[PDB]
Design an enzyme around this catalytic site. Structure first.
Site, PDB file in Angstrom:
ATOM      1  N   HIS E  18       0.981  -1.166   0.217  1.00  0.00           N
ATOM      2  CA  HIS E  18       0.003  -0.073   0.068  1.00  0.00           C
ATOM      3  C   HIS E  18       0.887   1.203   0.101  1.00  0.00           C
ATOM      4  O   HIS E  18       0.562   2.115  -0.776  1.00  0.00           O
ATOM      5  CB  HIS E  18      -0.977   0.105   1.163  1.00  0.00           C
ATOM      6  CG  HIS E  18      -1.744  -0.981   1.416  1.00  0.00           C
ATOM      7  ND1 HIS E  18      -2.031  -1.772   2.549  1.00  0.00           N
ATOM      8  CD2 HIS E  18      -2.755  -1.581   0.594  1.00  0.00           C
ATOM      9  CE1 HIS E  18      -3.060  -2.741   2.238  1.00  0.00           C
ATOM     10  NE2 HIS E  18      -3.428  -2.675   0.939  1.00  0.00           N
ATOM     11  N   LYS E  42     -16.577  -6.880   6.997  1.00  0.00           N
ATOM     12  CA  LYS E  42     -15.174  -7.489   7.027  1.00  0.00           C
ATOM     13  C   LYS E  42     -14.731  -7.830   8.385  1.00  0.00           C
ATOM     14  O   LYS E  42     -13.858  -8.566   8.759  1.00  0.00           O
ATOM     15  CB  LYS E  42     -13.890  -6.757   6.262  1.00  0.00           C
ATOM     16  CG  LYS E  42     -14.145  -6.802   4.848  1.00  0.00           C
ATOM     17  CD  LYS E  42     -13.028  -6.037   4.120  1.00  0.00           C
ATOM     18  CE  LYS E  42     -13.284  -5.768   2.652  1.00  0.00           C
ATOM     19  NZ  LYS E  42     -11.939  -5.135   1.932  1.00  0.00           N
ATOM     20  N   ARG E  91      -1.779  -6.493  -8.618  1.00  0.00           N
ATOM     21  CA  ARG E  91      -0.765  -7.332  -8.310  1.00  0.00           C
ATOM     22  C   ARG E  91      -0.609  -8.545  -8.949  1.00  0.00           C
ATOM     23  O   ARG E  91       0.222  -8.755  -9.837  1.00  0.00           O
ATOM     24  CB  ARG E  91      -0.588  -7.649  -6.655  1.00  0.00           C
ATOM     25  CG  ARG E  91      -0.716  -6.637  -5.567  1.00  0.00           C
ATOM     26  CD  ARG E  91      -1.071  -7.574  -4.357  1.00  0.00           C
ATOM     27  NE  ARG E  91      -2.142  -8.289  -4.204  1.00  0.00           N
ATOM     28  CZ  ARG E  91      -3.192  -7.813  -3.112  1.00  0.00           C
ATOM     29  NH1 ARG E  91      -2.995  -7.139  -2.254  1.00  0.00           N
ATOM     30  NH2 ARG E  91      -4.278  -8.399  -3.282  1.00  0.00           N
ATOM     31  N   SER E 129      -2.987  -7.470   3.077  1.00  0.00           N
ATOM     32  CA  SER E 129      -3.054  -7.369   4.566  1.00  0.00           C
ATOM     33  C   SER E 129      -3.500  -8.738   5.465  1.00  0.00           C
ATOM     34  O   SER E 129      -3.261  -9.098   6.196  1.00  0.00           O
ATOM     35  CB  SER E 129      -4.256  -6.345   4.648  1.00  0.00           C
ATOM     36  OG  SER E 129      -3.968  -5.188   4.309  1.00  0.00           O
TER      37      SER E 129
HETATM   38  C1  LIG Z   1     -12.349   0.735  -5.709  1.00  0.00           C
HETATM   39  O1  LIG Z   1     -13.405   0.906  -5.074  1.00  0.00           O
HETATM   40  C2  LIG Z   1     -13.302   0.374  -3.567  1.00  0.00           C
HETATM   41  C3  LIG Z   1     -12.103  -0.481  -3.393  1.00  0.00           C
HETATM   42  C4  LIG Z   1     -12.182  -0.992  -1.927  1.00  0.00           C
HETATM   43  C5  LIG Z   1     -13.127  -0.640  -0.916  1.00  0.00           C
HETATM   44  N1  LIG Z   1     -13.293  -1.207   0.135  1.00  0.00           N
HETATM   45  C6  LIG Z   1     -14.290  -0.589   0.885  1.00  0.00           C
HETATM   46  C7  LIG Z   1     -14.899   0.360  -0.129  1.00  0.00           C
HETATM   47  C8  LIG Z   1     -15.885   1.168   0.112  1.00  0.00           C
HETATM   48  C9  LIG Z   1     -17.348   0.677   0.094  1.00  0.00           C
HETATM   49  N2  LIG Z   1     -17.670  -0.293  -0.925  1.00  0.00           N
HETATM   50  C10 LIG Z   1     -17.672   0.332  -2.164  1.00  0.00           C
HETATM   51  O2  LIG Z   1     -17.878   1.354  -2.354  1.00  0.00           O
HETATM   52  C11 LIG Z   1     -18.095  -0.925  -3.258  1.00  0.00           C
HETATM   53  C12 LIG Z   1     -18.240  -0.420  -4.724  1.00  0.00           C
HETATM   54  C13 LIG Z   1     -19.550  -1.218  -2.923  1.00  0.00           C
HETATM   55  C14 LIG Z   1     -17.073  -1.981  -3.201  1.00  0.00           C
HETATM   56  C15 LIG Z   1     -14.107   0.138  -1.240  1.00  0.00           C
HETATM   57  C16 LIG Z   1     -14.213   0.913  -2.740  1.00  0.00           C
END
Ligand SMILES: COc1ccc2[nH]cc(CCNC(=O)C(C)(C)C)c2c1
Ligand SMILES: COc1ccc2[nH]cc(CCNC(=O)C(C)(C)C)c2c1
Ligand SMILES: COc1ccc2[nH]cc(CCNC(=O)C(C)(C)C)c2c1
Ligand SMILES: COc1ccc2[nH]cc(CCNC(=O)C(C)(C)C)c2c1
Ligand SMILES: COc1ccc2[nH]cc(CCNC(=O)C(C)(C)C)c2c1
Ligand SMILES: COc1ccc2[nH]cc(CCNC(=O)C(C)(C)C)c2c1
Lengths: 160, 160, 158, 158, 160, 158
Positions: E18, E42, E91, E129
């Site tokens: 990261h 999660k 990756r 992670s």
């Molecule tokens: C490339 O967009 C990401 C990547 C990792 C991510 N981990 C959490 C989020 C925010 C909540 N989730 C979302 O907004 C989705 C679209 C439902 C996944 C998040 C967004």
């Protein structure tokens, strides 16, 4: 040949991607059973009754679709339904791998059930019930990915 | 060279795919430790004692196999067992990706432990312990994928 | 006495191939680095050049034997009394072809076990083809090749 | 009356192709096994040889029609009044190209539905290319090919 | 052009992979928001406050990085932050598939937010992670994969 | 002033390439669309034809510069004072090769950052190769190409 095909899945909820696949299946086969798995292990957002009612209404315009719920092993249900064609939608590589494992297993279980893979429109090639629900839960617009009745039920579900 | 190899995994339960891999490993290396992880995070169907007993009986015909349970990091166990060869089975692409990540991590942890990838028979290239259990839970026939003793224990497990 | 074979075109042999063959020598008593004539691929280096380059680049490894072959893999491996076939793991696209070869080789010689070894992260993104392509554009490839191979590649492209 | 087309180079037709076309005949009323002229690939067998070999290898299947074509897929399928296009599923690398072809074919002829069938585990790791390669090295390919195809391949390589 | 980019994720915990991605993003774009998702689904090892504090300290040497927590849909947050660039680290193949689905969804939600994929060093191409935490839980050395402050907090977390 | 380079063969430039370069221009101040001489691939169109076609197809984009090059990527990018290298993401098979190129390019020029952009779903299944193949069979490719490119492709195949 008067083919009976089965299109199984959780359909939690049924999306435009599933409508696309089942529409292609109906243009190819005489009778298509859209088979909704009880799937309690996945802990679905919509009850089996809700998923069946939503899919029934979203496929009502297709005269050769029968929406039914089932709790058995898919192959056990398919054998009792006299289906010889098993419909699967292939969107991408990740689908492919798991789908090959399922198809070989299903063939071991019921060799007379032929797995056929249909390809959805580019439009639905990057969606899943899981992703749509996740976006909806996080206050994202999913109207484009769902039948109107499904969109209304998803909004109602997430409001309470 | 008098090589000691380790074949780790959950083996919940041991399948014909695992028997295939461990048989190939015994034809290549002098001593093969089939190492069963306690794996409480996965919440296994069979206890560690059951998995060890099932694997012991399913590999009894192989004179250079030692079935042992372990709870450490695999690499910590492998180092204490004086193993310099790490056996992995490669069935398909999805395996490959995760297996490369594990192998690079294991190499960081223990550089003297060499990861080797063996390829199972086409016969077992589409199965997993997870898929076999799922089919068995749903009243599907899994007799072909398992050693007889494992099939008997799986039936007994699912009856109660 | 466990005899392994590491086949390929090795056009030319790279640090990735040296990495794989070094891992193989630490695992097996005798390792045959087998260079395929491969006229279908139309190699940059002849079989004789490829053998000489690999011989010199592996000379420090006492249990490596460099040999050229035009035979069917299964036949050369039987004829060499090997029971292990070494392959390196790179990309998914390599892996898929490697599974097809391994199943074919198993059909032809079931007692010849295909084993896949994983190279260092350092060599996980290189190939003989990519190194040649960089060199054709006068790019610095010293890092990816044994010194003797680098010298022969420069001489070849001059 | 449901008419399906199974296109390809079939250079030569293998047991994997026979498996796919047999599955197609059990699903659809009429199956056209369509052999592409494919001069870009520079095939081992001519279109006439490829058609004759496939005709003889599928003769036991009453609802198979073997035809050669140089046409654009969508055009030949329309001209043949087919609405189903059969493809076999092998590897991920095949799948990716198959999706590109299927989307292109759909653009050209939306009423032509691409269907993917899965071969037996037995033929899941073979290709016409790999079988030819084994045969070029005098390897035993009897298991992967219909008898007539095996005889023609031996004759061709002699 | 004075570009504002967003680099979202769970960062549970932030790893050297990261740090690599966010460092590349800062060399390309004027302002980089490292956006930490609350991600309660999660069930993260580190609280949002801990993840924000760890990432703040691990990126302190980068003058054009802003570490912020967020609970909305990423795209809803990105729109309110006036970001037009969305940073993703690629990756391997498994990343690729899911990342394409997310990127098409994010584009549907916010077309003015352009997804860009950056490639980490070979050094971090096989870590996550999840894998680091798993190795750490099993008493494996993860010092090499983490910023010093993150390594100290991970040890402290696993001791209690 | 952020200078990006979008290299490739562009034989010919398609709507997929126009999509990627348009996304690049909305992100970076100056975008060099760099056309590789690529004689190894034996292109349908010469470097001069490829440059002229791309110039005309990108003329509406004020911050695009179309240039031909025979140089090593890293050298041309340094010589052009670019720090960003644009690639489009298509299939897994493309992605794997793209990672190898990107790691090589990084070894050669660490200050040149590879960035991957994702095209519209519309162009996610096309390539210059597939469009040429459709056109070789007299198939309608008007949808996949800029008008000037479509006209030149028809003229070339006539
Ligand atoms: C490339 O967009 C990401 C990547 C990792 C991510 N981990 C959490 C989020 C925010 C909540 N989730 C979302 O907004 C989705 C679209 C439902 C996944 C998040 C967004
Ligand atoms: C292609 O067969 C499917 C696809 C999606 C599915 N979702 C649920 C089921 C039914 C229960 N599960 C099974 O029958 C297996 C074989 C154990 C997965 C189902 C079946
Ligand atoms: C190739 O190494 C394996 C394979 C399967 C495995 N199943 C369980 C383990 C032991 C505990 N886990 C570990 O040691 C990791 C590295 C955190 C995964 C195991 C190891
Ligand atoms: C993993 O087996 C390999 C790898 C690279 C290879 N290059 C040349 C050969 C020998 C000739 N080819 C064969 O025997 C096949 C099986 C027909 C391809 C070879 C074998
Ligand atoms: C799944 O469609 C196939 C598969 C194999 C094929 N071999 C030859 C053809 C016909 C000519 N080619 C075309 O029409 C394309 C679409 C431009 C490639 C063919 C089609
Ligand atoms: C992502 O980098 C690319 C992509 C397409 C390309 N076509 C031509 C080039 C330049 C010459 N080739 C090189 O410099 C390599 C790195 C040796 C291949 C090029 C670069």
């Amino acid at each position: 040949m008067q083919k009976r095909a089965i299109y199984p899945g959780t359909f939690d909820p049924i999306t435009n991607g599933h409508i696309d696949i089942v529409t292609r299946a109906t243009q190819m086969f005489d009778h298509v059973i859209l088979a909704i798995a009880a799937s309690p292990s996945k802990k679905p957002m919509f009850t089996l009754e809700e998923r069946v009612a939503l899919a029934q209404q979203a496929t009502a315009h297709l005269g050769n679709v029968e929406v039914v719920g089932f709790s058995d092993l898919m192959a056990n249900f398919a054998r009792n339904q006299h289906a010889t064609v098993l419909i699967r939608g292939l969107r991408a590589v990740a689908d492919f791998e798991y789908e090959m494992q399922l198809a070989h297993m299903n063939r071991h279980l019921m060799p007379e059930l032929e797995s056929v893979f249909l390809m959805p429109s580019k439009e639905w090639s990057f969606i899943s019930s899981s992703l749509v629900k996740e976006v909806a839960r996080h206050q994202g617009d999913v109207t484009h990915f769902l039948p109107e009745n499904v969109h209304q039920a998803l909004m109602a579900k997430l409001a309470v």
